[PDB]
C-alpha cells in the first residue's frame with residue numbers, strides 16, 4: 011500500500027487504542043461531543059470555537075475524511091487543547107486529558123516512514 015494509507019492504518023490503530031478498555035478510566039470524558047447544556051457548561055461554545063471528541067474522529071476516519079496522519083493528529087490534539095483552554099489546569103478532566111495525550115503522543119511518534 012501507499013505511505014498515506016500505511017500512516018492512516020497507524021492512526022486508526024491509535025484511535026482504536028484511545029477508545030479501548032485499557033484507557034477507559036481516563037478516556038471516557040473524550041468519547042462523545044461535550045453536551046454543554048446537559049453539563050451546565052453554558053460558556054463552553056463561547057470559549058471553544060471548534061469542538062472535537064473521539065466519536066467525531068472515528069466518524070471522520072470511517073468516512074475517509076482524513077487524507078493524511080497530520081490531519082488526524084490535528085483533530086486529536088484540538089480535542090486535548092479544548093480541554094486545556096476551557097478547564098482550570100487543576101481540574102480532574104485536565105489530568106485525564108494529559109494521561110490520554112501521553113498515550114497518543116508516544117504511539118503517534120512510532121508513525122511508519
Ligand SMILES: CCC(=O)c1c[nH]c(C(=O)NC)c1
Pocket residue numbers: 039040044049050051092093096097103
Ligand atoms: C460538569 C463538568 C464536566 O462534566 C466537564 C468539565 N469539562 C469537561 C470537558 O472539558 N470535557 C471534555 C467536562
